[PDB]
Amino acid sequence: ASPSSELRRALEANEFIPYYQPLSPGQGGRWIGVEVLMRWRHPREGLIRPDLFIPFAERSGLIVPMTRALMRQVAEDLGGHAGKLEPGFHIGFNISATHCHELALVDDCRELLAAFPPGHITLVLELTERELIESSEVTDRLFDELHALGVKIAIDDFGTGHSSLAYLRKFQVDCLKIDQSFVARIGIDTLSGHILDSIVELSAKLDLDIVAEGVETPEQRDYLAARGVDYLQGYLIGRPMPLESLLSSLTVQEGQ
Numbered sequence: 650a651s652p653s654s655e656l657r658r659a660l661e662a663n664e665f666i667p668y669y670q671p672l673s674p675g676q677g678g679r680w681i682g683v684e685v686l687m688r689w690r691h692p693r694e695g696l697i698r699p700d701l702f703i704p705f706a707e708r709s710g711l712i713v714p715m716t717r718a719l720m721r722q723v724a725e726d727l728g729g730h731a732g733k734l735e736p737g738f739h740i741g742f743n744i745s746a747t748h749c750h751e752l753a754l755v756d757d758c759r760e761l762l763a764a765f766p767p768g769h770i771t772l773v774l775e776l777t778e779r780e781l782i783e784s785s786e787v788t789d790r791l792f793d794e795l796h797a798l799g800v801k802i803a804i805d806d807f808g809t810g811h812s813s814l815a816y817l818r819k820f821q822v823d824c825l826k827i828d829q830s831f832v833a834r835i836g837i838d839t840l841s842g843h844i845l846d847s848i849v850e851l852s853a854k855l856d857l858d859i860v861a862e863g864v865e866t867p868e869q870r871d872y873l874a875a876r877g878v879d880y881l882q883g884y885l886i887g888r889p890m891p892l893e894s895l896l897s898s899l900t901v902q903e904g905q
Contacts, residue, residue: 653709656702659689665715666690667723668889671898672739672860673881675874679902682739682771684882686889687719703745712745713753720761726892728764733899739880741773741803749780750787755794762798772800775826778807781816792820803860809847817855825852827878829863835872849876 659665669683689697706712723740740761748754758772774795780788781804792802803824807813827848834841852859861873864883873881887898 652705653711656706656709656711656715659691660711660715660718663718664690664692665719666891667719667726668891669895670882670889671887671895672741673886675861675870675878675881677870677874679735679905680886680899681735681737681880682741682773683895684741684743684773684775684889685719685723686743687715688889699743707745707747710747713748713751716742716745716748717757720757724761724764730896730899731765731769733896733903734765734770736769737771738769739771739773739801741775744774744776746777746780749776749791752787752791752794754791755798758795758798758800762800768799772798773803773824774800775803775805777805778813778816781820781822784820788820796821801858809851814851814854817851817857822855822857824858824860827859827861827873829883832861832863832869832873832883833865835869846876849878 666688668686668688670686671680672682672684674681687699687703689699689702691697703712706715720742727734727740744754754774758774762770762772795802801823802820803826804817804822805826805828807817807825825848827845831841831845831848835845849859851857858879859877860880860882861869861878862882864870864873864881864885866885869883870881870885890898
């Protein structure tokens with residue numbers, strides 16, 4: 650058996666499915682976007698989460714075709730329901746390091762954006778700090794061309810000192826993610842609060858948006874709102890959901 654061939658078979662069989670995790674404004678209200686997460690609907694194993702196969706998919710060299718197919722499914726899923734999405738609605742993808750080493754990503758983004766009315770959605774790509782530090786002329790060109798499409802870049806796994814500030818400034822990054830591990834320790838751990846405040850401080854310096862992950866309690870939500878965090882996701886807002894569930898909830902939020 651070849652794990653690599655199994656991944657290619659699954660891709661051919663359309664077993665990699667987008668799940669949509671909602672993003673809420675820090676001050677509450679209607680959902681302002683979704684982050685798309687790739688699940689594997691395996692006929693025998695059931696629904697497998699991406700932390701269990703994406704790292705292997707990256708090693709196999711298949712992560713870019715998988716992500717491309719995901720972006721195409723999202724266009725098909727949501728392109729016809731623009732009237733359920735308030736203008737400016739965010740659609741987020743986790744982009745692998747290999748995807749950032751080639752310019753095809755620009756065409757992938759251009760294609761997804763063409764599935765919606767012009768300017769109707771905001772495409773957000775999530776990268777790690779490593780992709781900025783281990784950059785080349787290709788990176789410079791990529792981010793430039795993405796920014797000209799109106800695509801936004803969100804960064805995770807970053808430092809908050811002047812060293813990291815230089816990279817974030819050079820590449821004109823748009824958003825910072827607060828990791829769930831920090832959010833989970835709100836009200837429990839003083840150091841975690843100081844870290845959280847440092848992230849907020851960096852964001853103010855460079856005028857960046859902040860998305861906080863793993864928001865599960867009203868305490869956490871309120872703490873984050875108090876510091877001006879723009880967007881929240883987590884169990885409190887909602888778990889990643891299949892399209893059918895997303896459309897149902899957007900339909901409700903329409904009417905209200």
